[PDB]
Structure formats: structure tokens, C-alpha cells
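Morning - N-[(1R)-1-phosphonoethyl]-L-alaninamide inputs below, output right after.
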Amino acid sequence: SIDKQQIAASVPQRGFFGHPKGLFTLFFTEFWERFSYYGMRAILVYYMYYEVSKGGLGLDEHLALAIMSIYGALVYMSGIIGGWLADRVFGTSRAVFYGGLLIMAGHIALAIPGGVAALFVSMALIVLGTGLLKPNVSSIVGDMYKPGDDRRDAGFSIFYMGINLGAFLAPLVVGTAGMKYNFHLGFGLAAVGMFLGLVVFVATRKKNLGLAGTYVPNPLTPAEKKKAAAIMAVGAVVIAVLLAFTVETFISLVGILGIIIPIIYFVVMYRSPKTTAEERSRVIAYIPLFVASAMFWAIQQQGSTILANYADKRTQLDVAGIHLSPAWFQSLNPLFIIILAPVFAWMWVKLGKRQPTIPQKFALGLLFAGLSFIVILVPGHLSGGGLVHPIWLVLSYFIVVLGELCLSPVGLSATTKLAPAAFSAQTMSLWFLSNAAAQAINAQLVRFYTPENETAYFGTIGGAALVLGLILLAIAPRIGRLMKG
Ligand SMILES: C[C@H](N)C(=O)N[C@@H](C)P(=O)(O)O
């Protein structure tokens, strides 16, 4: 490990809009990675269930939707593994580099002529690569700022703007390309983009980042190097013999992992000898806040799967002479975030002390989440049948964003405020954990998504979210009071 002062001194503190020129390197690296990921994700589900003569792979729609919901859960969970690998063996700079190579290799598999075997390989590479790159790239950006640097939060804000920007642009590029022209072409522009990210990183990291993340923060002790490699080796031999299990089996496995693991985390924390009587109570108080998070993300993440299908199957795409591409509907979430975020930010300041508490804001997200589904089921219920106006789907995304800007910004804060001191490091994973768990559950509910019980589907899920939101409101007083401030 190297002290932050010496590291920061090797980073050119001027260059990119009043920030280090290494921010340019880290903004665009993450941007293009996000770009490729969201672009590839924008057309992936269609590529799976579209018939083979329409360029697709010709899988069952429920299977395709289940894979998508599982994908995110694996990606989210992968960051925890890669975060450990960077911190304990690689270093953030090197781990970002490796992830970039794997991710790109994943897109190449998709872009070249192939079938479902290529799709499964591509998933593994991207999951593994994102787990290395995504959590570690933001870590390097902190290494550029010296202890006391006021610009830090502004630099981070610029960095996160790259995520949303990629999420907005990508479907309007890869989607328009992949859908209208060729599916392998859309997957091709993802690889090209990710390549640019690698090129900008590898070429400009020697000058712009310097000693940033090139060190191993918490290396393995000699004896620990053996055990870790042994387990990895043992695990590698154990998994291979079991290999010698359908895709739906793997799905069920992830689905139950998305339930067991959260239960495991809570019991471990609550029963920890390193905790105090007060810290354990806060852990209990964190439970409904975790459940509410999962319920929210369950509805939120379905926007890239269920509603992606709804746009492909249940929506009037021909409006005003122009034929819309269904993947373009994925641009709606980040677009509203970009727009409404400063509006919400101004609101919370305008409110001041009269603003709702953190637990109260969790319920607000829950109300809007369930409400978005209530709206989304209405037009298909009113009409006798056929396609519905895209204004309904658009309005559905808009409402879910309102719920997001309420819950998401205080998500990490609520976790840190309630997590024990001995578990201060697992604090970001725990927040990311509620999101993955929702998507592992999301995949199990896909079988319920038929054109028949469509109303029952949206109504039950949305109804449950509304019910839970009202419950959380009731216990919001006691929960807010327990927070460490
Ligand atoms: C694409 C959309 N703007 C988005 O980033 N959604 C996040 C919740 P995801 O990256 O986890 O899918």
C-alpha cells in the first residue's frame, strides 16, 4: 500500500475542466464500457427470441426474459468478486485493464457469426469483465484527489454523468443499428465502442493516472496465497465433474441464491460477536428498508426486460408515419434521470427541514413503482385488444423515475447509517445486494407474464409494492429515529 499523498502527487491535478486530465481517461473509459453494455443489452433480448430467419436465435420469450433478469444479478454480484480481486491481488488499475479485455472479448463472440453457445460464452466473459472493471474504475478516480481536495465530489459527479450518458445514447445507436439493419452489427458497434475505452485507458494511463491503482492495497499473506489458490483449484475440479443441468436449472439456482444470500448476510451480522446491542437493533431496522429496495428494483429492472417485450409485442410502434424501434424505449430511463435529477435536488433544498426522512423516501419510491405498473396495465385493460399507445409506456417509465430519484440517492446512506462498524466495508455490497436479489426474483416471475393474465401480472406486483409502501410509511417514524445521523 502507498499513502494517498504520494499517489495524488503523481497525478496531474490540472487538465480536464478544472480537474485532473486523468478524469478524462476515467470518464470516457467508463462511458464507452457503459455504452457497449447498455447498447448490447438494448437488443439482446430481441436477438434471443426473434426467429432465426429474422436474424434472431429463436428461443422461447420466457426463457429469453429469464436470462436477461439473471444477467443483471450476475453482473451486480460480480463486482463484489472483482472488488476483492483488485483490492487483494490486482490493484484497481490492473483489474480495470483485465476486465476491459474480457468484456471486449465477450462482445466479439456475439458480433461474429454464432448461435446460443456464443451467447452463453459472451455472457460469462462480460459478467466477469464488468465485475473487474465497473467497481474499480470509480475507485481510481478517488486516487486522483488529495486529502482535502474540495473538487472530489464534482469529479465524481462528472464520472457518474458518463453512466447515464451511455445509457441514453447506446440504444439510439446500437438499437437503431442492430434492429433495423443487422443484429450482429449492433453487437459489433458495442465491441468497437468498448475497444475505444480500452485504447483510451491503456494509452493515457501512464501520463494521466501515474501511481493511481497500480498498487495492491491489501495483499495476501504468504500462507493466504496458498489457501486461496487451493480453493480456486479445488473448486475448478469440483465444478468440472458436476458439469460432466439445464439453463433453467442455473436460473433456479441463481433465483434461490438471490434469497439465501441476503438471509445469510443478516444472520451473520446480527449474530456477530464484534457488534454491540445497539448495532444489532439497527440491523433489524434495516430489514424493511432492504425489502423495500428489492421490491422497487424488481419493478425498476423489469423495464429492461418485461417492458422491453411489451414495447415489442403490445405497443403501437407506427406513429405519425415513422416506425419506432422497440429498443429505443430503453433510452427513456436515463433521459428522465438526467432531466429530473437537478429538479429533485433543488426540491430537497427548498424543503430543508420539512423534507421527508430517508425511510419516508423509500416508501415514496415504492408508491411510484407500484403506481407505474398500475398505469401500465390500464390501456391494455380499457382497449378490447391490439396495440396500445406508446404514451402509456412512456408515462410508465416517467413515474418509475420519480420513485428512483427518491429512493436511490439515499440508498447507500441508509445502509451506512445502519450497518455495524465491523461491517463498514461490506456496506456498498449490501446496497448492491438488494438490486441483484430483485433480479434473481424477477426471473422466477417471468413465467407469469402472458398476454392473458397481463393485468393480473402488473396489478399483483404493483399492488404489492403499494401495500408495502404504505406499511413502510407507518414504521418510517421509528426507523428514522434509530438512524445514526
Ligand atoms: C439503462 C438505465 N439507464 C440504467 O442504467 N439502469 C440501471 C438500473 P442498470 O445498469 O443496473 O441496468
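Note: Residues 38, 72, 167, 304, 330, 333-334 surround N-[(1R)-1-phosphonoethyl]-L-alaninamide (CB under 6 Å).

O.
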